Homo-oligomer: A and B are copies of this chain.
Amino acid sequence: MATNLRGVMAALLTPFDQQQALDKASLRRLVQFNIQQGIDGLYVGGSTGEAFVQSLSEREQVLEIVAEEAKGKIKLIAHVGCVSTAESQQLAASAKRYGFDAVSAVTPFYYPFSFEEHCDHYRAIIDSADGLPMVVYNIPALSGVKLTLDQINTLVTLPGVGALKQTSGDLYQMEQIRREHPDLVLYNGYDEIFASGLLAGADGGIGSTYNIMGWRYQGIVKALKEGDIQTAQKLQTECNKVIDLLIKTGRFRGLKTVLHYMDVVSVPLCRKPFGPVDEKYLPELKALAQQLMQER
């Protein structure tokens, strides 16, 4: 329990004010809101936090504030990944300094790097994490990095690696990873297949939609544990109706908008080049916010 990273953890969004600067008050509210719905932990500074449109200092500012708000209460994983190894090392040291339970790093992107280079990248960050377990981050869709199973097996067996965030829809590979690593903490990365992902071998998950309905995902975990497939399927279906909408509106901004109507986020904008939500979607988003609030 004290060091168990297994569970349902929300990929935290980063609230900005009207001038696109960090909205500290809204960030703190989002953190407490997540804690309030019984989330197991928070994955901070990942893709969902718009880390790649933030500077290093801005990312450390978020990490620091989140730690003040939730250290001790729930598990905290800091995504310190950057294309640059040096930059990633700086964020890792900060994460440890702030008291995070673990660090994570997306496979470095844009430039083609050999597998050996990817491995040394992780080793160097692990060194700077000085004790904090590393969560390997496999998300080929956005990174463009396509690892094989043998390569994935090598990464998760590196000293200091304590988990794998599997943002892949291949549930055959999910089962193979579980079979090869019975004790590995394995996070399902695509919210829209959560139930199936757990059935294949994942033992938890990390996702952006957890910010507005994390309890549903917890419900699925419970349902599958008790053998209630009907309930598990029903919950996944409701999640997917929501995801269908968020894909039309834009996932991050759609979530920020729902959180805005829930009185958590002051201004629901993402950073440019991200545009605003198309006004034609507001009635559905408002209706969803109302529904979720009644449900919770």
Residues from chain B with Cβ under 8 Å of A59 in the complex: none
Q: How many residues of A contact B (CB 8 A)?
A: 60
A272 adjacent to B193 (CB under 8 Å): no
Chain A positions 93 through 125: 1 when the CB is less than 8 Å from some CB of chain B, otherwise 0? 000000000000000111101101110110010
User: Which of A5-13, A30-38, A70-78, A224-232 interfaces with chain B?
Assistant: A224-232
B171 adjacent to A196 (CB under 8 Å): yes
Q: Knowing A56-B55, A274-B117, A275-B120, say if A196 contacts B200 (CB, 8 Å).
A: yes
Query: A243 vs B176: C-alpha distance in the bound complex, in angstroms?
Result: 11
Query: A211 vs B39: C-alpha distance in the bound complex, in angstroms?
Result: 45
Our pick among B53, B117, B144, B224 for the contact of A273 (Cβ within 8 Å) is B117
B199 adjacent to A233 (CB under 8 Å): yes
B271 adjacent to A86 (CB under 8 Å): yes
A273 adjacent to B85 (CB under 8 Å): yes
Contact sample, A vs B, 17 pairs, CB 8 Å cutoff: A47-B111, A53-B83, A54-B84, A55-B87, A84-B273, A85-B273, A86-B271, A109-B109, A110-B143, A172-B243, A176-B240, A196-B199, A199-B199, A199-B232, A227-B227, A227-B228, A227-B229
Query: A66 vs B175: C-alpha distance in the bound complex, in angstroms?
Result: 35
A172 adjacent to B169 (CB under 8 Å): yes
Q: Which of A169, A176, A236, A273 has the most CB of B within 10 A?
A: A273
Residues from chain B with Cβ under 8 Å of A175 in the complex: 192-193, 236-237, 240
Our pick among B52, B170, B229, B275 for the contact of A116 (Cβ within 8 Å) is B275
Residue of B nearest to A192 (CB): B172
Copies of this chain per assembly: 4
Least Cβ–Cβ distance between A269 and chain B, in angstroms: 12
B121 adjacent to A273 (CB under 8 Å): yes
Least Cβ–Cβ distance between A42 and chain B, in angstroms: 20
Closest A-B pairs by Cβ, 6 of them: A85-B272, A227-B227, A196-B196, A172-B192, A53-B84, A121-B273
B199 adjacent to A195 (CB under 8 Å): yes
Q: Which of A124, A197, A225, A271 has the most CB of B within 10 A?
A: A271
For window 230-284 of chain A, which residues contact chain B by CB distance below 8 Å? Answer: 232-233, 236-237, 240-241, 243-244, 271-275
